[PDB]
Amino acid sequence: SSFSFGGFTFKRTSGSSIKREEEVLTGNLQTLKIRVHEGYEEFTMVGKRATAILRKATRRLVQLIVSGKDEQSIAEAIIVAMVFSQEDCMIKAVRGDLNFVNRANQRLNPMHQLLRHFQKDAKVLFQNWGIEHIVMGMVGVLPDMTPSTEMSMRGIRVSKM
Numbered sequence: 001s002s003f004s005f006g007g008f009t010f011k012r013t014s015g016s017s018i019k020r021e022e023e024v025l026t027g028n029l030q031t032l033k034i035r036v037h038e039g040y041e042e043f044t045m046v047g048k049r050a051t052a053i054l055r056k057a058t059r060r061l062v063q064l065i066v067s068g069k070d071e072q073s074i075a076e077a078i079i080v081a082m083v084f085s086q087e088d089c090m091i092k093a094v095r096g097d098l099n100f101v102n103r104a105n106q107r108l109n110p111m112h113q114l115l116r117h118f119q120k121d122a123k124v125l126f127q128n129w130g131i132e133h134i135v136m137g138m139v140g141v142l143p144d145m146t147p148s149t150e151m152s153m154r155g156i157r158v159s160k161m
């Protein structure tokens with residue numbers, strides 16, 4: 001499958017997936033009905049200012065190796081990948097005031113609403129994703145997008161263009 005999401009072209013290089021309509025609770029305990037893809041899948045993400053290799057299991061990001069134009073371009077690709085992963089911590093990072101999802105679908109699907117939400121401000125997302133201890137050529141990236149050699153956002157690596 002070769003599809004479009006958040007301005008990136010996704011192309012599956014390994015794995016398979018079946019769909020399942022499921023109910024998810026946000027950090028605001030809001031119920032969203034999402035189309036969950038089940039199975040280990042590997043994708044290329046090709047955009048205009050960033051490219052990445054995404055390794056993912058059902059509602060879990062295994063690894064994301066990002067290459068881009070700059071910190072903003074890479075953060076963008078990172079956000080799309082985290083929303084696409086359908087991970088619980090991404091969903092649970094939807095919390096606050098006005099931070100709700102219009103349940104009549106209309107303009108955007110839940111995945112497109114989650115995306116439009118994290119594009120506005122990724123602080124809660126990146127900060128609620130987690131950090132892990134960390135290879136030459138690939139650096140780690142902290143939730144504030146600072147490159148580090150000792151810690152990175154879980155599963156996230158930044159490769160040189």
Ligand SMILES: Fc1cnc(-c2c[nH]c3ncc(Cl)cc23)nc1N[C@H]1[C@H]2CC[C@H](CC2)[C@@H]1c1nnn[nH]1
Pocket residue numbers: 001003004005017035037041083084085086111112
């Ligand atoms: F065509 C597609 C073919 N395959 C996938 C797909 C394979 N593995 C996956 N794992 C997680 C997710 Cl999130 C999707 C996938 N996704 C497609 N499109 C998705 C895709 C997300 C939302 C929109 C637009 C692009 C669209 C959709 N999601 N739910 N209904 N439609």
